[PDB]
Design a protein around this ligand. Structure first.
Ligand SMILES: NC(=O)c1ccc[n+]([C@@H]2O[C@H](COP(=O)([O-])OP(=O)(O)OC[C@H]3O[C@@H](n4cnc5c(N)ncnc54)[C@H](OP(=O)(O)O)[C@@H]3O)[C@@H](O)[C@H]2O)c1
Ligand SMILES: NC(=O)c1ccc[n+]([C@@H]2O[C@H](COP(=O)([O-])OP(=O)(O)OC[C@H]3O[C@@H](n4cnc5c(N)ncnc54)[C@H](OP(=O)(O)O)[C@@H]3O)[C@@H](O)[C@H]2O)c1
Ligand SMILES: [Mg+2]
Lengths: 252, 251
């Protein structure tokens, strides 16, 4: 039980940070893992570390998820390597920080293109394989911004993540009839390349910690359990949900 | 709840829910700028506000998915009135397809209108709203902020959840200027956008089962809440998603 041996997962943004943490969790449970990002060497390095540590089959593929044709090719590559797909983790994401009244318009759309459009494109193109799975599970990565916007200057990102939440609900609704579960993991505050600047400001970090009942920020390992749980047959009656892994942030 | 001397910009004010809201604001004494893609329809809607309520109006053609057109819309508001107190972002579209078959251009287009367009209007309205002693932005959500009751509306749902989170981000950033940003999330109202749903007796029967008040919404149901949120009496209300849904979300 919670065994994912023989399963195949696609992890966008699997080359580092939270996506890599999730990829490790799935590989540790026996899942074969496809790592997609925009840097092929980094994706390949991550894939190779997964095979070395966990003994699972892996593949690396260069894909900008905001580019639909590349997503279509990503999914065709999965089908060719594995012939199957059970689990999608949409962890590819960017952030750009500006006051909303000065936000450059190309950057505003770009953040939504990667975070929201790209997440849709991957779900859309994964559908035909996921329909062939006896245990199909889509895991989208949200953020606290699904519920609350705790920092200034992240309007585009917030928009993208609220969009991912509602998209997740729509897909859960439409694709439940095919047995396809669609859920969001919404992380709290985790030190990564994306959040480095915030973490480097001791005033912001002290404020963050005051709002975390467990008394620490998140590490990638904190996401491994919930990812494996949602991928597994043990979460077969769980769909359309937004699950916060945030040390109690949203409860206080 | 007097809006006399106030100026509102209503996108999607030419018909349906935006028009009902425009009427509510005008009835409370607000001057109204009606913006939509059809100048005749916007102009006629604006003139009906002036005739019925005796307020100053203006109509201006704008496709809210086009940033330069939105910039020009706000220049037009400044030229006509020199001020702006209230923004209602009611411009919106829907396109219905199974998610797995949704055409990619239409998927983006629904988000371009509903979410990017709502953002562009807020962004361009900022400089005038900053000068108001009672600034209030009212974004139009949907049940899809919380729950997706129908199939074939993935793009629309994504747009409206986007709007809800955008609203919170703006409320967060602009609270320091006293600018309130809130969402009115309607339940089910018979309009041009929902006609196809309403025309299916099975679907309508299902919808009414899920409405404690036992009826669908009409544009008049949104007048009070729009006026309330625009008024000086809602000064401590910001970042909220308020459902006007006959109890849908409670059951
Ligand atoms: N860290 C947090 O506190 C936090 C909180 C809530 C949610 N999140 C979310 O968690 C996810 C992972 O972020 P992270 O914190 O782990 O940051 P990260 O270390 O910077 O990882 C982001 C990943 O996405 C990839 N990526 C970015 N744009 C892409 C695109 N267009 N196509 C394909 N891959 C792309 C990156 O690879 P490349 O740069 O090479 O493409 C990388 O593998 C994102 O959805 C983010 O919004 C993070
Ligand atoms: N009816 C409901 O049950 C319901 C429920 C929840 C939310 N809503 C929302 O309520 C709002 C109003 O919709 P409705 O039901 O009243 O539908 P509607 O009768 O079709 O009205 C839509 C309005 O938006 C305008 N519009 C559409 N695209 C535009 C664009 N690109 N630029 C500027 N104006 C644009 C339309 O005018 P032109 O076509 O002339 O541009 C019209 O004034 C929408 O945001 C919708 O999503 C409706
Ligand atoms: Mg909270």
């Amino acid at each position: 039980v919670f065994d994912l041996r023989g399963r195949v997962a696609l992890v966008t943004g699997g080359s580092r940070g939270l996506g890599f943490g999730i990829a490790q969790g799935l590989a540790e449970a026996g899942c074969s893992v496809v790592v997609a990002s925009r840097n092929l060497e980094e994706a390949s390095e991550a894939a190779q570390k997964l095979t070395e540590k966990y003994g699972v089959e892996t593949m690396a593929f260069r894909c900008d998820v905001s580019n639909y044709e590349e997503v279509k090719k990503l999914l065709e590559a999965v089908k060719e390597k594995f012939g199957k797909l059970d689990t999608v983790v949409n962890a590819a994401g960017i952030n750009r920080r500006h006051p909303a009244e000065e936000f450059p318009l190309d950057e505003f759309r770009q953040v939504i293109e990667v975070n929201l459009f790209g997440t849709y494109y991957v779900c859309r193109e994964a559908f035909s394989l996921l329909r062939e799975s006896d245990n199909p599970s889509i895991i989208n990565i949200g953020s606290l911004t699904v519920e609350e916007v705790t920092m200034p200057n992240i309007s585009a990102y917030a928009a993208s993540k609220g969009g991912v939440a509602s998209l997740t609900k729509a897909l859960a609704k439409e694709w439940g009839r095919y047995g396809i579960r669609v859920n969001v993991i919404a992380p709290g505050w985790y030190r990564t390349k994306m959040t480095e600047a915030v973490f480097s400001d001791p005033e912001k970090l002290d404020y963050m910690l005051k709002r975390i009942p467990l008394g620490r920020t998140g590490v990638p390992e904190d996401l491994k359990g919930v990812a494996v749980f949602l991928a597994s047959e043990e979460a077969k009656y769980v769909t359309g949900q937004i699950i916060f892994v945030d040390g109690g942030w949203t409860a206080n």
